[PDB]
Design an enzyme around this catalytic site. Structure first.
Site, PDB file in Angstrom:
ATOM      1  N   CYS A 290       0.870  -1.167   0.000  1.00  0.00           N
ATOM      2  CA  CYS A 290       0.000   0.000   0.000  1.00  0.00           C
ATOM      3  C   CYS A 290       0.913   1.225   0.000  1.00  0.00           C
ATOM      4  O   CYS A 290       0.704   2.174  -0.757  1.00  0.00           O
ATOM      5  CB  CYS A 290      -0.869  -0.006   1.262  1.00  0.00           C
ATOM      6  SG  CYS A 290       0.066  -0.312   2.809  1.00  0.00           S
TER       7      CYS A 290
ATOM      8  N   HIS B 180       1.441   5.088   9.607  1.00  0.00           N
ATOM      9  CA  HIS B 180       0.520   4.086   9.111  1.00  0.00           C
ATOM     10  C   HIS B 180      -0.446   3.482  10.125  1.00  0.00           C
ATOM     11  O   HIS B 180      -0.090   3.222  11.274  1.00  0.00           O
ATOM     12  CB  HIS B 180       1.390   2.985   8.482  1.00  0.00           C
ATOM     13  CG  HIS B 180       0.646   2.019   7.623  1.00  0.00           C
ATOM     14  ND1 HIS B 180       0.863   1.915   6.267  1.00  0.00           N
ATOM     15  CD2 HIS B 180      -0.300   1.100   7.926  1.00  0.00           C
ATOM     16  CE1 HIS B 180       0.079   0.976   5.770  1.00  0.00           C
ATOM     17  NE2 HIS B 180      -0.636   0.465   6.757  1.00  0.00           N
TER      18      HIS B 180
HETATM   19  N1  NAD Z   1      -3.898  -4.220   5.714  1.00  0.00           N
HETATM   20  C1  NAD Z   1      -3.475  -3.455   4.701  1.00  0.00           C
HETATM   21  O1  NAD Z   1      -3.754  -2.263   4.652  1.00  0.00           O
HETATM   22  C2  NAD Z   1      -2.624  -4.068   3.573  1.00  0.00           C
HETATM   23  C3  NAD Z   1      -2.247  -3.166   2.491  1.00  0.00           C
HETATM   24  C4  NAD Z   1      -1.470  -3.742   1.445  1.00  0.00           C
HETATM   25  C5  NAD Z   1      -1.053  -5.047   1.371  1.00  0.00           C
HETATM   26  N2  NAD Z   1      -1.475  -5.844   2.470  1.00  0.00           N
HETATM   27  C6  NAD Z   1      -1.055  -7.283   2.464  1.00  0.00           C
HETATM   28  O2  NAD Z   1      -2.154  -8.118   2.152  1.00  0.00           O
HETATM   29  C7  NAD Z   1      -1.941  -9.422   2.813  1.00  0.00           C
HETATM   30  C8  NAD Z   1      -3.164  -9.729   3.655  1.00  0.00           C
HETATM   31  O3  NAD Z   1      -3.415  -8.545   4.426  1.00  0.00           O
HETATM   32  P1  NAD Z   1      -4.646  -8.398   5.406  1.00  0.00           P
HETATM   33  O4  NAD Z   1      -4.451  -7.096   6.102  1.00  0.00           O
HETATM   34  O5  NAD Z   1      -5.970  -8.492   4.775  1.00  0.00           O
HETATM   35  O6  NAD Z   1      -4.553  -9.493   6.581  1.00  0.00           O
HETATM   36  P2  NAD Z   1      -5.565 -10.525   7.187  1.00  0.00           P
HETATM   37  O7  NAD Z   1      -5.124 -10.975   8.515  1.00  0.00           O
HETATM   38  O8  NAD Z   1      -6.872  -9.902   7.245  1.00  0.00           O
HETATM   39  O9  NAD Z   1      -5.466 -11.881   6.303  1.00  0.00           O
HETATM   40  C9  NAD Z   1      -6.336 -12.177   5.179  1.00  0.00           C
HETATM   41  C10 NAD Z   1      -7.053 -13.526   5.319  1.00  0.00           C
HETATM   42  O10 NAD Z   1      -6.150 -14.643   5.047  1.00  0.00           O
HETATM   43  C11 NAD Z   1      -6.698 -15.774   5.657  1.00  0.00           C
HETATM   44  N3  NAD Z   1      -5.691 -16.843   5.666  1.00  0.00           N
HETATM   45  C12 NAD Z   1      -4.550 -16.973   6.442  1.00  0.00           C
HETATM   46  N4  NAD Z   1      -3.829 -18.098   6.185  1.00  0.00           N
HETATM   47  C13 NAD Z   1      -4.572 -18.717   5.175  1.00  0.00           C
HETATM   48  C14 NAD Z   1      -4.364 -19.959   4.439  1.00  0.00           C
HETATM   49  N5  NAD Z   1      -3.324 -20.770   4.645  1.00  0.00           N
HETATM   50  N6  NAD Z   1      -5.318 -20.280   3.481  1.00  0.00           N
HETATM   51  C15 NAD Z   1      -6.399 -19.433   3.269  1.00  0.00           C
HETATM   52  N7  NAD Z   1      -6.670 -18.284   3.889  1.00  0.00           N
HETATM   53  C16 NAD Z   1      -5.726 -17.966   4.838  1.00  0.00           C
HETATM   54  C17 NAD Z   1      -7.012 -15.239   7.036  1.00  0.00           C
HETATM   55  O11 NAD Z   1      -7.895 -16.110   7.788  1.00  0.00           O
HETATM   56  C18 NAD Z   1      -7.669 -13.874   6.699  1.00  0.00           C
HETATM   57  O12 NAD Z   1      -9.104 -13.893   6.629  1.00  0.00           O
HETATM   58  C19 NAD Z   1      -0.610  -9.315   3.576  1.00  0.00           C
HETATM   59  O13 NAD Z   1       0.509  -9.908   2.885  1.00  0.00           O
HETATM   60  C20 NAD Z   1      -0.484  -7.791   3.774  1.00  0.00           C
HETATM   61  O14 NAD Z   1       0.887  -7.417   4.037  1.00  0.00           O
HETATM   62  C21 NAD Z   1      -2.246  -5.413   3.565  1.00  0.00           C
END
Ligand code: NAD
Ligand code: NAD
Lengths: 338, 339
Positions: A150, A177
């Site tokens: 992001c 952030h």
């Molecule tokens: N939060 C942000 O603002 C943001 C911004 C940019 C990029 N990201 C990236 O996006 C990714 C996910 O971020 P997020 O904030 O949504 O986190 P999150 O904790 O909400 O994870 C997303 C989902 O993945 C599921 N999950 C975990 N292990 C799994 C598996 N083995 N099989 C299937 N589903 C599984 C979890 O249960 C959860 O619902 C990360 O790599 C993060 O760095 C996040």
């Protein structure tokens, strides 16, 4: 294009919401670690983005959103997901644990034609930031795509404007952030000693690869920038503070701002739908809650620009969940076009 | 001990009270605010950030008794109405936040006080001091209205002084992630500043700071070389500065930068000056804002956050905006006594 979501979390669900109602995209399958009923409920009620407007119904192994039946899976191992038999073209890898090439490539060995990693990755075929280097994408050579972070989607466009106008020699970025799920609610074990601390009651210093890995989207800046992140107590919404030393000292703060006003105008007149929400030139005095729900990769805050000879400082906001998810939606659309 | 009076028994006024309590060098004899002794005593006793007060606090009609010592309490919104003279007060801590202007701050002097310390930057004070940076510039015979600058300056000045003496600062920028304070609003309300008007506990609020721009008052040579800004965030106390500077002599490595800070901290400690004991702390543990709540240093250098690119140097230091600054006020009062 058929789309599959692996990891229906903050990014996954925001991606779902961002591309819903868009005829260019058709989400047909979702995979996480729970049942359909829990995912449906999480999709309907969001603590940050409000109540989903569409109609959500839960079934045994699927959810029906506005009459559309979406297959739900609960396979922790990505190799067990039948993307192929579902007719999925692109898979959104958003679980946060498969950023490595061999794990991300499992989706391909499953019938997927392309995988988009919602984060910086190690050894992807190409890291893309819309509005910066999306043209360096080659359909037949790239199957594992990283949409960076992001932070990078906010940083890259802004540094691009500064570089093309004044020539960045070196710089540093500090991003204030919002906290994310990679942090802990209360002090708990975590590989990073600081990310382990209570997120809603601490200013938490942590690393970010946005500046250091800028070379992946803007080659000539490689080794020119360093950065860091300061996680603070807001559930969503972030800001970057970028200080750069330039070759062409601007004549004033307004000359710097004008460049951003013009860059934003250029993106909107390019005719490319995937470049319409890259940069927003703002002059109103705003705060984090004002940009929650904003789809831009970067909301340039003109009033915050400062200049001391060839030292330039700017600030730009970004809804870390929403803006990034909208870029994921636009990246999927871009792939359709090739 | 020097007799001290406090005007504005708020976050700073009360923290100042707690920080200098028990210290034989100081004696607080009077307090003025806008409410009754009972409300003041209660606020002093129970603090949302610094815990329950150690001593025993009792309230009377015109005063509070702390550990058996009576402290007159006044409720005069107009400072001219306070009898510091009859109370024998030497120094008055001006911490209401609304008497930063010279003519208002000097009203305490006309009331009998010998000297005033404005707990914030001010225009036209006899002098602005930051311990560990320019206290020697203080002249007991020409300086009666003293500014102790801001919490941020007390953190920034000491740090840039280290970088300037070691590598020479050509220019730089400072961003401070700062806890919210009472100059902000709980929920969106009218405020001169369009952003500080917004709900403080749920927003990242950009706002101006004069710390960098006005650095020249404590370090003349850096005037016009630094700029800065502030980002108020949802934390009740505890702040952090992030400083980027371009230097004349590029450092050989991050460790060389860190070493300068480790050494500067050491020098303060073996100076023998009691008022310089807690200026700078060299820290290497990975900490977060709550870890520095209650820390008395003007700046807690976070070694692991240091980075360098050619002649571009970046450091980060913490500061408990309420406590560190308050202990500096305690040390400043003691310093004045030593002169
Ligand atoms: N939060 C942000 O603002 C943001 C911004 C940019 C990029 N990201 C990236 O996006 C990714 C996910 O971020 P997020 O904030 O949504 O986190 P999150 O904790 O909400 O994870 C997303 C989902 O993945 C599921 N999950 C975990 N292990 C799994 C598996 N083995 N099989 C299937 N589903 C599984 C979890 O249960 C959860 O619902 C990360 O790599 C993060 O760095 C996040
Ligand atoms: N909060 C911090 O971390 C911090 C750090 C450094 C300097 N300061 C400065 O110290 C000053 C006070 O800061 P604060 O955070 O404690 O705010 P505060 O509002 O909590 O304290 C102000 C106190 O002054 C009293 N007061 C107001 N008008 C008065 C009047 N006319 N007569 C008598 N009493 C009056 C109020 O009742 C209140 O208790 C400000 O100028 C501020 O900028 C604050």
């Amino acid at each position: 294009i058929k789309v599959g979501i692996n990891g229906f979390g903050r990014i996954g669900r925001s991606f779902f919401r961002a591309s819903w109602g868009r005829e260019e995209i058709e989400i047909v399958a979702i995979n996480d670690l729970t049942d359909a009923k829990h995912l449906a409920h999480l999709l309907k009620y969001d603590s940050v983005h409000g109540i989903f407007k569409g109609s959500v119904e839960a079934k045994d192994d699927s959810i029906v959103v506005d009459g559309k039946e979406i297959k739900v899976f609960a396979q922790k191992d990505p190799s067990q997901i039948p993307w192929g038999d579902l007719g999925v073209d692109v898979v959104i890898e958003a679980t946060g644990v498969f950023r490595d090439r061999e794990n991300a490539s499992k989706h391909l060995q499953g019938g997927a034609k392309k995988v988009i990693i919602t984060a910086p990755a190690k050894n992807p075929d190409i890291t893309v930031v819309l509005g910066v280097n999306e043209e360096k994408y080659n359909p037949k050579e790239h199957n594992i795509i990283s949409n960076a972070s992001c932070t990078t989607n906010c940083l890259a466009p802004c540094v691009k404007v500064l570089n093309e106008a004044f020539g960045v020699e070196k710089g540093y970025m500090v991003t204030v952030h919002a906290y994310t799920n990679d942090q802990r609610l209360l002090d708990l074990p975590h590989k990073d000693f600081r990310r382990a601390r209570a997120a809603a009651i601490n200013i938490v210093p942590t690393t970010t690869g946005a500046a250091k890995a800028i070379g992946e989207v803007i080659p000539e800046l490689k080794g020119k920038l360093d950065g860091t992140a300061r996680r603070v107590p807001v559930p969503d919404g972030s800001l970057i503070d970028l200080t750069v030393v330039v070759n062409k000292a601007p004549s004033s703060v307004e000359e710097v701002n004008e460049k951003f006003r013009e860059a934003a105008q250029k993106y909107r007149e390019s005719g490319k739908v995937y470049l319409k929400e890259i940069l927003q030139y703002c002059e109103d005095p705003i705060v984090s809650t004002d940009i929650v729900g904003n789809p831009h990769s970067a909301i340039f805050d003109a009033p915050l620009t400062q200049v001391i000879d060839n030292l330039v400082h700017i600030a730009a906001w970004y809804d870390n969940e929403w803006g990034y998810s909208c870029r994921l939606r636009d990246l999927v659309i871009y792939l359709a076009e090739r």
